[PDB]
Amino acid sequence: YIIYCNRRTGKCQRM
């Protein structure tokens, strides 16, 4: 699944 928040670039996950 997706458990990572790339807030750095402006992307996030759902988990």
From Swiss-Prot:
Primary subcellular site in the record, as a coarse category: secreted
Keyword terms: Antibiotic, Antimicrobial, Disulfide bond, Fungicide, Immunity, Innate immunity, Secreted
Cellular-component GO terms for this entry: extracellular region
Disulfide bonds: C5-C12
Cellular localisation: Secreted
A single GO BP: defense response to bacterium
Chain's role: Insect defense peptide with a broad spectrum of activity against Gram-positive and Gram-negative bacteria and fungi. No activity against S.aureus. Stops respiration in bacteria but does not permeabilize their inner membranes.
Domain notes: Four regions are important for the activity: the C-terminal loop, the last three C-terminal residues, the stretch of seven N-terminal residues and residues 8-9 are necessary for the antifungal activity and dispensable for antibacterial activity.
Protein name: Thanatin
Whole-protein coverage range: 8 to 21 of 21
